[model samples]
Target chain A: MDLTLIIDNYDSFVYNIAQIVGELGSYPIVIRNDEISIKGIERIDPDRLIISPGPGTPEKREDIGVSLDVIKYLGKRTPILGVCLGHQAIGYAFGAKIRRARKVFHGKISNIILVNNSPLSLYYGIAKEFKATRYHSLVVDEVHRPLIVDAISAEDNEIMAIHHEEYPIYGVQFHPESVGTSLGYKILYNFLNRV
Target chain B: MDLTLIIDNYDSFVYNIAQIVGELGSYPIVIRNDEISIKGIERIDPDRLIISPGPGTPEKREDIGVSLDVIKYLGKRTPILGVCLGHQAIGYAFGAKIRRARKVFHGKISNIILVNNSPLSLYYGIAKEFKATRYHSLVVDEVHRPLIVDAISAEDNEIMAIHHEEYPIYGVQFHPESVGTSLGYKILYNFLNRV
Candidate 1:
């Protein structure tokens, strides 16, 4: 099974994330930069588009400023799993609030309890609560109107993960590719195999 | 949920393996090198031993040459998973044959089909056939007398994976810690979580 991939800058586990998602099959075209235009996404005809997690705020950075167009155009039609900054980008597309966290979680591990058990999150196979690697300074604050708060942190009550209410899309404030997240690979496999 | 870890040199994926195995609950005591005596193993009192994958041959390399002592002394009593050079080390301890493959398989993906279906490999959850990332030049050709061939490649028809007949020990020429091997994490989870 051949698949298409669109990637962003370093969030530290690009290849690892691809390795998890690639369980579906090989990736012929892996676009690692956002210099491409939305009309160009039509030219590539990607099977699934990915807004990879990277350093910096989604609003402040130029890397994912273009990602808003990618998310809106692709929307629910394409399977997208945005991580870290990408998470905030998708939240912004649906009118969710984006702002800085009380603390920057770089290299920190925290417990996130799954708040929404949607079928789209079927790959989230562990119990209600599990440890996750947190490495972001910004977060998409609690917004029930647009995006679903699928997971919440056990401490400080911060948003750790979310999903689009009406699209085949997902976003997370943590890095599943990091070794700090234990069931990360399983969660990745679950996401890919969720047909 | 505590497990033991004695690691070799810097391979990009060491912490990732520890992370997956750490799902049991404890942050493992990582021994980067075997400066400790074999008697010290009794002092540290590890639950399971892992021989992580890295560069060089099992025969010529001095880095993990002590792993021979670690495996020989702890053999059959401890649950061991020897990867790459570690696999070759186990073979050397068991008097198994070692030689270079007709072609080196670094960074190349191959498929391994389960042949022995042993109980220790029970959590290897895919169907009989699965794809994996292979990165070894030296391989344990065969061990008809002591070890059993648990899995072999569908492509080269060479030995890709092996296990001790009596011990809860395993060795793979491929990197199961890799995302290239889609089920690599599950294989690790099954190996660790089994009763």
Candidate 2:
């Protein structure tokens, strides 16, 4: 299945991540959501969607034309992997509660301990202990009842990875594409392979 | 000397680097260059400046309102350490060429072999070999005569870090703050101390 990776100026990191996954032999297309016309999505068919990470709070970015539209297009069925800011957007889309952290966790390597055998763990090859980078100040306080998965905090023992249980959707607070996190590429490999 | 770190977006990786250096007993202040009013700079006293990295080419960023002003304020007198985008901006400020690479390098750990000695070496404990995380598609090419000091390539020996011999200015194409490059913090620490 071809993966359509949404691209935007604010979250250029996603483009890099998409390129890395593409190099791994996945058929990935980097689409600038803002540049694409409404007719463009009609022409391209995507089996899965990968929403990339961006800067700033997801709620504050109303200027991103394509991201809003792409999210609406993906709706539910497509397999989606949201990293960093992308993860927060997924939470917002699902009616989850998000708030600024009292103490922001920016730029620290923390352990991501897998709490259960979820799709994310299998993809990340999560052992009892794994390290990942944290940069976000916002937290998904309460997941919506319909799309919640119990995520364990790898850093402060709070929620790190969330899955929509019934849907083919996953979100990670840490960036797997980052080099700081040793097993980052492997996690991307797993995500691409699973989809 | 008090070092003020200028950033438009607070990426966790960059913020953590500031925190690490601050913890080491260096007085560091993180400021959003875009948010700073002209009067803000007048009120604060800075001995040196630490330019934090961010997404997007410097040419496209109108958000960092005070970036050019701040650069002009410090000019040649202040010691400036530019990481990734910050590096490119310094290059541009000093009449170096900044443009997107024909082939971008992103989200990978690459070794940066030191070709010359500078204050940066002190951070790596004067080590010869160090790995750093690269996430930039843009590079400084055809640089002006003043900014070019040392250039090291990746495994292929591409130009990774460029230094300005005269000014306390240096630029790294790779992220020293990223976990991918564990020694990045030291390089930054060394630069901070040098300034």
Candidate 3:
């Protein structure tokens, strides 16, 4: 299978991400900077795209910024998985408001409780509670109500993973490729396989 | 402040590794298969080398199998930090042995104790205990014991990290870039700054 991984400049360690994503089911093509011109996207053979996680705010990273044009390109055409910063970027592209968390959370072993069945749960597997690695200072605060399925978070309901059923898109505030969050590879596999 | 990242293939993600490593203190370059020769190593402007982490067995992967030559070319001339497979490959190239684990160990966390006054403690910080991310099925057994400073699951004491004081070389069994290991970036920064 063919896959694409887009990365922002601020994000280091893309190789590790690509290596793990490659283990899932596809030989990934990594895209860096604002190399997202129409022709660039056309050259890729994969039907699906995964916006790899990176550093910096999605709002400020113009290089990998999720423009409406890019969103229009991805709109309902192919399956997409947005991770961490990409998650917030997709929410912004989808008319959702991205905001900084009042208290930045970064550490190991955060709880993500599944509330309802969705494509995410199917790929991530359903469990009453699952531990995930989180390292973000921002979140999708005011998503368009109709597009959101459920809010994932710690046991205290900290709003973690998010999904948009209408567009076949999903985003997680945690790093799935991280060792702390063992399910990261499995979750990416689910996103690829399902798409 | 020039750096070069050598790779066996054209991978955009490899560039990211170069970039992250560069952020520590050097400019970066990515070298592909056959692009590396004795002359190529001689041409590095910065005169420093970093052998990055990659997939597959150290003995089996031809694409990433530049271990011995890389070591010989830069012998005792520059600082080097080996991660994951890079760690094992360096051991083999230096007259040590690497083999599959007697017991499979792949997951988010592994407990490791620090050797007192070990040089690795400089970058890893002084700690009696720390949790590291373990992703490999293979472990270095250090047969010659001529150059090794640490061991994992050693009969007397497990050596999770090692350093060759005379050669300016360091190796870690766990992935410091893995998110599961909370100190991944910090540990890397420490190596980049000190080594």
The digit string of per-residue lDDT tens for model 2 on B62-105 reads 63445655565565776667777777777777777777676566
Chain A TM-score per candidate?
A: 0.88, 0.83, 0.84
Docking band of candidate 1: incorrect
lDDT of 3: 0.60
lDDT of 1 by residue, B49-144 (tens): 778776666666575645777777786687777888777777767778888787778789998888875444544465687899988777787577
Q: lDDT by residue for model 3 over A76-96, one digit each (tens)? A: 776666777777777777777
Give the higher-TM-score candidate: 2 or 3: 3
**On residues A48-76, what C-alpha lDDT tens digit does candidate 2 reach at each position?**
56667766666665534455445545646
Docking class of 3: incorrect
TM for chain B in all models? 0.89, 0.83, 0.78
Q: For residues B77-162, write the lDDT of model 3, one tens digit per residue.
A: 76666666667666766777777766555764776665545455345563466667676677777545445655354322334666
Candidate 3 recovers a fraction of native contacts equal to: 0.00
Worst 10 residues of 3 chain A by lDDT: A36-45
Name model 3 segments beyond 4 Å from true. A61-63, A66-68, A117-124, B1-195
lDDT accuracy of residue B6 in candidate 2 = 47
Question: Which candidate leads the pack in TM-score?
Answer: 1
Question: Where does model 1 exceed 4 Å of error?
Answer: A1-195, B24-26, B117-119
The per-residue C-alpha lDDT of model 1 at residue A154 equals 83
User: What TM-score is obtained by chain A of candidate 3?
Assistant: 0.84
